[PDB]
């Protein structure tokens, strides 16, 4: 039996008022230690760019895994080429169920080979839809961008919209002005 | 947004097909192959009036296919198709440089707003003390 | 396996503050609260605010969690013997406002 | 033209085996014991409803009984888990074995028959009614 949650690392300890001194001298003077001023300086990042932590694997810059990589059928692969596989995808998802109805209204034993086809399917599909979300991102950020450009210039004709209003107003004073002459 | 949308429409298609298959599996009766054979029927079993049954078949197959129009409208309306990183980037930059000019536009803009804003409060304290030197 | 760096130790306990029980468990003890290491040590870890270090971090409410309480450290002087003044009602503030700072963020999640 | 995936002309697929379409009946060749226990026949006419007691198998034997042993009348027993107990030379000789295997504990010393005689001969005059 232990406590709930880890201690405050060995590493708080060569936080002293002599290192902190010392830390500037050691400056003008994965890491290698060498003594007791090189725990003040960050540590940079993992050559290898693959760090444990949480009982899993991050990386510096995440790039999205194929499905040859990762142990299954890529069937298809500037993305107009993969619209028109997502409608390819598709209609072969749909024939794919009509198929798994007929299977099934004929032999239902069969089907186990058509379920893993709709399953690959399915994950073509999705792992499409990821490899489009950089290019879906991008474009949301292209929408933020417009979105703010249009708040700005809607600003643009509100501050117009009050100054017309002053504008006609103040012909209209001018107008009760000669009346009242 | 429009791939979030699509996600949801993508499992509202496996939702409506194992829900008409357990609908097929479990509201189906027991057919005649003959006259003189022996039509029993189950108080456990689910039975259905044929015609109403084919009628809801009928709508889940209508809805599975209005829901795929909806999916083929969705992915039709996908945001960019024709353009690539390359593009992305290229819109990107001019937008960059196109928010930063109507920050400048803005700033002159409020600047102008400032100009009539002296104007009119100077009009509004030179009437005031006028009529204030007036009346005492 | 090698063992944990400095910097995969130091993220995974600035990243810790964003759950407050964690906060919470740390904070009743006297001793961490009351050592100027930990003060130190709590005034040595705004370099994760920066980039790129920032970019490593998954929950950035510790962040937020690790910005909020050294503003309670410029009221706090650390004396000859060690003892730690300030320090004795931050923690009654942090159960006093617990669940209301990881219910607001919560519904910021929403 | 465009293939679509897993939309394959040569591939193929068969009915079950057995095909549950037909009457599976006929297909093994059960109607004999269809139309056998069936409540009504097979040209219009309705057939005799089957006894809820097995009292007509027993009517070409005379016996002094006029109910039916049951579980619940006391008459019958937990009899099937003993009934569901198990346990050079021809086959001849070897099937001998295995009858006279099974003969041994139908005789003596297993069953005494003068032990018998004298035990039964205990009984003596008339019979009390309980």
């Given at each position: 039996v232990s406590s709930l949650y880890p201690p405050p690392p060995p590493y708080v300890k060569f936080f002293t008022q002599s290192n902190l001194e010392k830390l500037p001298k050691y400056k003008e003077k994965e890491e290698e230690i060498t003594c007791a001023l090189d725990y003040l300086i960050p540590p940079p990042m993992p050559k290898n760019q693959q760090y444990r932590a949480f009982g899993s694997i991050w990386q510096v810059k995440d790039q999205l895994p194929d499905l040859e990589s990762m142990g299954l059928t890529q069937l298809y692969k500037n993305y107009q080429y993969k619209i028109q596989e997502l409608r390819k995808l598709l209609k072969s998802l749909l024939l794919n169920y009509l198929e798994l109805i007929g299977v099934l209204s004929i032999n239902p034993d069969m089907y186990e080979r058509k379920v893993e086809n709709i399953r690959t399917i399915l994950v073509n599909i999705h792992h499409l839809l990821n490899e489009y979300r950089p290019h879906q991102s991008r474009e949301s950020l292209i929408m933020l961008l417009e979105e703010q450009l249009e708040y700005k210039r809607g600003e643009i004709r509100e501050i117009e919209q009050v100054c017309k209003q002053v504008h006609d107003k103040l012909t209209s004073i001018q107008d009760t002005l000669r009346t009242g002459s | 947004d429009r791939l979030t949308q699509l996600q949801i429409c993508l499992d509202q298609m496996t939702e409506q097909f194992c829900a008409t298959l357990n609908y097929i599996d479990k509201n189906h009766g027991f057919e005649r192959l003959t006259v003189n054979e022996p039509q029993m029927s189950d108080k456990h079993a689910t039975v259905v009036p044929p015609e109403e049954f084919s009628n809801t078949i009928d709508e889940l197959s209508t809805d599975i296919i209005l829901k795929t129009r909806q999916i083929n409208k969705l992915i039709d309306s996908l945001p960019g198709v024709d353009v690539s990183a390359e593009e992305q980037l290229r819109k990107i930059d001019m937008l960059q440089k196109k928010l930063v000019e109507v920050e400048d536009e803005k700033i002159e803009a409020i600047k102008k707003k400032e100009k009539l804003l002296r104007h009119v409060d100077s009009l509004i304290e030179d009437f005031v003390d006028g009529i204030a030197n007036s009346k005492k | 396996n090698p063992l944990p760096t400095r910097f995969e130790v130091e993220l995974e306990f600035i990243q810790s503050l964003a759950n407050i029980q964690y906060v919470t468990y740390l904070l009743?003890?006297?001793?961490?609260?009351?050592?100027?290491?930990?003060?130190?040590?709590?005034?040595?870890?705004?370099?994760?605010?920066?980039?790129?270090?920032?970019?490593?971090?998954?929950?950035?409410?510790?962040?937020?969690?690790?910005?909020?309480?050294?503003?309670?450290?410029?009221?706090?002087?650390?004396?000859?013997?060690?003892?730690?003044?300030?320090?004795?009602?931050?923690?009654?503030?942090?159960?006093?406002?617990?669940?209301?700072w990881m219910n607001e963020m919560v519904e910021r999640w929403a | 033209p465009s293939y679509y995936y897993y939309v394959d002309p040569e591939t193929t697929y068969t009915y079950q085996q057995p095909n549950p379409l037909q009457d599976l009946i006929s297909v093994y060749g059960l109607d004999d014991i269809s139309r056998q226990v069936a409540r009504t026949n097979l040209d219009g006419t309705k057939a005799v409803k089957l006894r809820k007691s097995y009292k007509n198998q027993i009517a070409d034997l005379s016996g002094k009984f006029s109910t039916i042993p049951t579980r619940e009348n006391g008459k019958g027993g937990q009899i099937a888990h003993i009934l569901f107990q198990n346990n050079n030379m021809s086959e001849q000789q070897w099937r001998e074995q295995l009858r006279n295997r099974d003969i041994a504990l139908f005789q003596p010393p297993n069953f005494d028959w003068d032990l018998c005689s004298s035990v039964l001969s205990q009984f003596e005059r008339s019979y009390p009614s309980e």
């Open positions: - | - | 009743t003890q006297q001793q961490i609260w009351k050592s100027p290491n930990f003060k130190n040590y709590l005034k040595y870890l705004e370099y994760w605010c920066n980039p790129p270090y920032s970019q490593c971090i998954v929950y950035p409410n510790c962040l937020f969690i690790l910005k909020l309480l050294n503003g309670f450290m410029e009221s706090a002087i650390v004396n000859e013997d060690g003892l730690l003044e300030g320090l004795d009602e931050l923690p009654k503030i942090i159960q006093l406002q617990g669940p209301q | -």
